[PDB]
Design a protein around this nucleic acid. Structure first.
Lengths: 35, 117, 191, 122, 138, 164
RNA sequence: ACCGCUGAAAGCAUCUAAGCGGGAAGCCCGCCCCAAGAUGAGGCCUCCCACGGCGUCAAGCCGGUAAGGACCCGGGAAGAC
RNA sequence: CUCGAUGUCGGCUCGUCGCAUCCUGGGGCUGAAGAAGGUCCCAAGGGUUGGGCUGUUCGCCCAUUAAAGCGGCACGCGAGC
RNA sequence: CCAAGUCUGGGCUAAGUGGUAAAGGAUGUGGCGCCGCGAAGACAGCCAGGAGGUUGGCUUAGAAGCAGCCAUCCUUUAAAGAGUGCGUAAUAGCUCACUGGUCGAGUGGCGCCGCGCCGAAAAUGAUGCGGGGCUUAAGCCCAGCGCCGAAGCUGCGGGUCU
């Protein structure tokens, strides 16, 4: 969502690279981190 | 069909650059280069963005038009022809070269095809 | 000849159950001229004279079944087109000519207080200042009456021979009676 | 047929007389109120305050138009007049009673209610 | 470097209006702090603020000391329009000479204050440098 | 770094590795952009890069291989869950005939290779020959039929949970 | 966009670089409308045969072949001409 | 640049781009069950109505509607009113 | 395209960056220093208890790590968790911040860098100058090498003023 400025929720929410892209991931709809 | 044997060449793998380059080179001077190979051909990795640029030849359509060929055949059309001008010789110099698909006379097959091949 | 075709009979409606207007169409079998194939090399149109008597005054189903009637001797009765079907016909516009941007092309003209002022018919404008001279956009008094018109969802209702002729579902053959009609039911949707 | 401010009488008794035609009811564009159709107009004048009253925001439908209606029966029908009936959101009349005939129509587009009240439906 | 008309004719002799220096707590060794590298008539206000919000998030022991302070200022629109411009003041600060000793997060083991200041940098404006002092930070 | 137990006929030509076995008749591909590894009684990873990068490149093949095998000998299995207080299924035709409302159930076919099973209407699952080609299709239906976890019901990957 | 499978480098996970799929009134195709003056003038069928005398690579001047066309006339929802 | 001269507001017509998208599809999000909303990512195809009072645009009001979009191009257009 | 090394040497790119941008992010990648250990046989998989006085103070109607304001100590023993964490009405389960067998040889950390990807949306139609180019493609950094190219400078010869 935040497109710009993502940084680790749940004590897990991972750091993944898709299309060089960095989009938050972690066992929660409440983390759908993306930029 | 069958023709001379003047400029007897082909293509495949090589670098879709200097490739044509000389093609003309002798494309100039005053020679006819009939080869072929298209597909086999070759050119920059980064396929992806690879097939992009020339899709930039793809839908580059300007009311006034702007076809942009859709078979290896071309790819080399452009390019090459690129090497030359557009006054007489040059021109002619574009009829004097000729290539084709598989083989009529004794990564370079994806962008095309891709955008038309 | 890949298809089937003839000319405009005319229109009239009448009967049915609710009632419905169509159009008549003339055409037995206008013979069979060669047939489409690009075999061994370039093949398309031959001509083993067998035509009319005057004609030298000027001297894979569709096409296939053809082979059926085009080898029979030439002609080929029209009508698979049967009971309740959708071919498509391509009339010839209509010598309507060169007209004002009025009907030629939908547009509102000279309003009121000036919708008369011995004023009237005439488009509004072309192009702005900076943009650049002109566009190939805005049509013009683009003549009409001659277009190779046609359409779609062309449903045929019925037919009978006494004279090989066809009854149609809604006319709009484009061109006028005694006119050049060609039909087909192309990529039908009602299928 | 029948829009902007074309007027049309009553045949029911709702307590009206005549009504101006605002919008043709249906959805955007649309430019026409043809019997069966439903109109968004108001009172141009209504009896001595029956129940409606002059200048009353309203909803009425189509039943009388000299515009001539082509019956699927390749037939033709029209009237000496142009007017219709009020309604209760629920395509439901008010006029307790009818007046000049009308046309099958109605039925086809829902309204019986009047369909029969009508002295005669043509 | 345009600066003002004088220290007592235009606008010179103020308090500049702000929120004093020291906070946090002592600490003999532990060198915990912050400085910069950017040049900028440090935005007073912005300034004053910032630092403060710093305390807002911590509270006590962590040399919330801070070695800054504006003392001159700009000016602009007031009068006719654009031409012969008189002057109307507003917004003093001080030149952050291309880096230097900012404020100090100084104390034994109290990073619970390092993160703080940290929060202090985040803020600020001209980027900032996160650092330690003689020894580091413990 | 692995093995090739019983029957694993192995032929690595051009870059293709042909593996013949019991119920695991399979012909897979395998990079020429690297180094093959085979010795008739084992086999393993080849270092055509030795460098982190390609390193993994095969550090993947390894498995890759591992697949051919286990795949060629003992085929694969995907465990599916039929959790629907209305939905339901039980093979029919040379394919499956699931159901879950709407009106028109659906017939799904495991083209040559893939093969589904209706152990018992409620639950089901697939047994192909390539974990690869399996897991995929296996799922490609597990969804095919909305698992909607709004409160519990639908096709779900074995070992799921609930919601709220 | 967006969702997945198979699995490295991170001996555990990951739609992932490489391997394979899902997914849009959207692009390409398809449906109508031109259209090789696209000097790369395209295809094909159906007609017409080697005429005269002159210096030449006379590819230049004449009767021709209704093959064939035209012009002039008479007409067209063909149409300013 | 133009004063040996580029005729300036609103309207009219004829429109043409653009996307930060109003309607429209596709998506992930929700304090989302349904339904309907909110949040944000992808997409411009097509489309985005009658009146009123105002020189006006703007704007308020009336009845619609899926919607009744933001803005370019001398805030397009006077050798077109 | 247009004249001149698809020179050679050794690095760095895997985005077409080059072919405009900032705050701001992230086990991208390549080169440098630190803390702990692998025979107290090490970090990530797996077996298990997943210790007791801890169930302290404001608010308690519920702190009793898993509402939040203050504590942060003691322990009989295999050590310890000021119990960072998903919750519910507080309590009530899991999770390492703790280690045995099974392996076994490199595993996690911050400072210093040189290259690089998100943020970075626009109106006629598209853009490195164009065709174009991914270990001489080519770019960029550090090294040697020879050729181009002005009307400038040498050779040719004439002019002309001081």
């Amino acid at each position: 969502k935040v497109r710009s400025s993502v940084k680790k929720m749940c004590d897990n929410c991972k750091v993944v690279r898709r299309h060089g892209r960095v989009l938050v991931i972690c066992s929660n709809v409440k983390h759908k981190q993306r930029q | 069909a069958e023709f001379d044997a003047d400029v007897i060449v082909d293509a495949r793998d090589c670098i879709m650059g200097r490739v044509a380059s000389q093609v003309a080179e002798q494309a100039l001077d005053g020679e006819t280069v009939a080869v072929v190979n298209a597909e086999r051909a070759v050119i920059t990795g980064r396929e992806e963005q690879i097939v992009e640029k020339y899709e930039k030849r793809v839908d580059i359509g300007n009311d006034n038009g702007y076809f942009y060929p859709k078979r290896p055949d071309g790819i080399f059309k452009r390019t090459i022809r690129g090497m030359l001008p557009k006054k007489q010789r040059g021109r002619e110099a574009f009829e004097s070269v000729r290539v084709y698909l598989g083989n009529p006379y004794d990564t370079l097959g994806e962008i095309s095809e891709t955008l038309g091949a | 000849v890949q298809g089937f075709a003839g000319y405009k009979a005319g229109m009239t409606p009448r009967e049915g159950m609710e009632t419905v207007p169509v159009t008549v169409i003339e055409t037995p079998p206008m013979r069979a001229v060669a047939l489409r194939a690009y075999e061994q090399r370039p093949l398309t149109e031959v001509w083993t004279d067998e035509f009319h008597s005057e004609l030298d005054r000027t001297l894979s189903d569709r096409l296939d079944h053809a082979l059926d009637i085009v080898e029979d001797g030439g002609e080929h009765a029209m009508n698979i087109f049967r009971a309740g079907e959708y071919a498509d016909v391509a009339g010839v516009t209509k010598g309507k000519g060169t007209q004002g941007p009025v009907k030629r092309w939908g547009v509102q003209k000279r309003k009121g207080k000036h919708a008369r002022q011995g004023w009237r018919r005439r488009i509004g404008n072309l192009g702005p200042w900076n943009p650049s001279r002109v566009r190939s956009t805005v049509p013009q008094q683009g003549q009409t009456g001659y277009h190779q018109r046609t359409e779609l969802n062309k449903r045929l209702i019925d037919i009978g021979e006494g004279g090989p002729y066809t009854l149609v579902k809604g006319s709009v053959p484009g061109p006028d009676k005694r006119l050049v009609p060609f039909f087909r039911a192309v990529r039908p949707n009602d299928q | 047929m029948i829009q902007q401010e074309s007027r049309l009488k009553v045949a029911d008794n709702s307590g009206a007389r005549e009504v101006l035609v605002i919008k043709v009811l249906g959805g955007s564009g649309r430019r026409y109120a043809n019997i069966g159709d439903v109109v968004v107009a108001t009172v141009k004048d209504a009896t001595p305050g029956g129940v409606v009253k002059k200048g009353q925001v309203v909803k009425a439908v189509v039943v009388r138009t000299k515009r001539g209606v082509r019956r699927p029966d390749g037939s033709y029908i029209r009237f000496d007049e142009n007017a219709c009936v009020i309604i209760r959101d629920d395509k439901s009349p008010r006029g307790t009673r009818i007046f000049g005939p009308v046309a099958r129509e109605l039925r086809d587009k829902d309204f019986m209610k009047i369909i029969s009240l009508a002295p005669e439906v043509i | 470097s345009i600066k003002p008309t004088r220290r007592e004719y235009i606008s010179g002799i103020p308090g500049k209006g702000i929120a004093q220096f020291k906070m946090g707590n002592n600490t003999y060794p532990a060198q915990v702090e912050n400085v910069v590298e950017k040049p900028v008539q440090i935005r007073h206000n912005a300034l004053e603020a910032a630092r403060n919000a710093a305390n807002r998030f911590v509270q006590n022991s962590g040399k919330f000391r801070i070695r800054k302070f504006p003392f001159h200022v700009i000016r602009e629109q007031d009068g006719d329009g654009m031409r012969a411009p008189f002057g109307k003041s507003v917004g003093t600060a001080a030149r952050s000479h291309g880096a230097n000793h900012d404020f100090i997060a100084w104390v034994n083991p109290d990073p619970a204050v390092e993160f703080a200041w940290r929060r202090a940098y985040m803020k600020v404006t001209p980027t900032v440098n996160i650092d330690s002092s003689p020894a580091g930070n413990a | 770094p692995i093995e090739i137990p019983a029957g694993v006929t192995v032929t690595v030509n051009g870059n293709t590795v042909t593996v013949k076995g019991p119920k695991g008749e399979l012909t897979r591909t395998f990079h020429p952009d690297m180094t093959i590894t085979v010795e008739g009684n084992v086999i393993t990873v080849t270092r055509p890069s030795d460098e982190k990068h390609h390193r993994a490149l095969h550090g993947t093949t390894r498995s890759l291989l591992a697949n051919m095998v286990e795949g060629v000998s003992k085929g694969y299995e995907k465990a599916l869950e039929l959790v629907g207080v209305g939905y339901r299924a039980s093979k029919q035709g040379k394919k499956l005939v699931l159901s879950v409302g709407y009106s028109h159930p659906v017939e799904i076919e495991p083209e040559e290779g893939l093969e589904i099973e209706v152990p018992s209407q409620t639950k089901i699952i697939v047994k192909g020959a390539d974990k690869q080609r399996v897991g995929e299709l296996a799922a490609n239906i597990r969804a095919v039929r909305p698992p909607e976890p709004y409160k519990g019901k639908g096709i779900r990957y074995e070992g799921e949970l609930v919601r709220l």
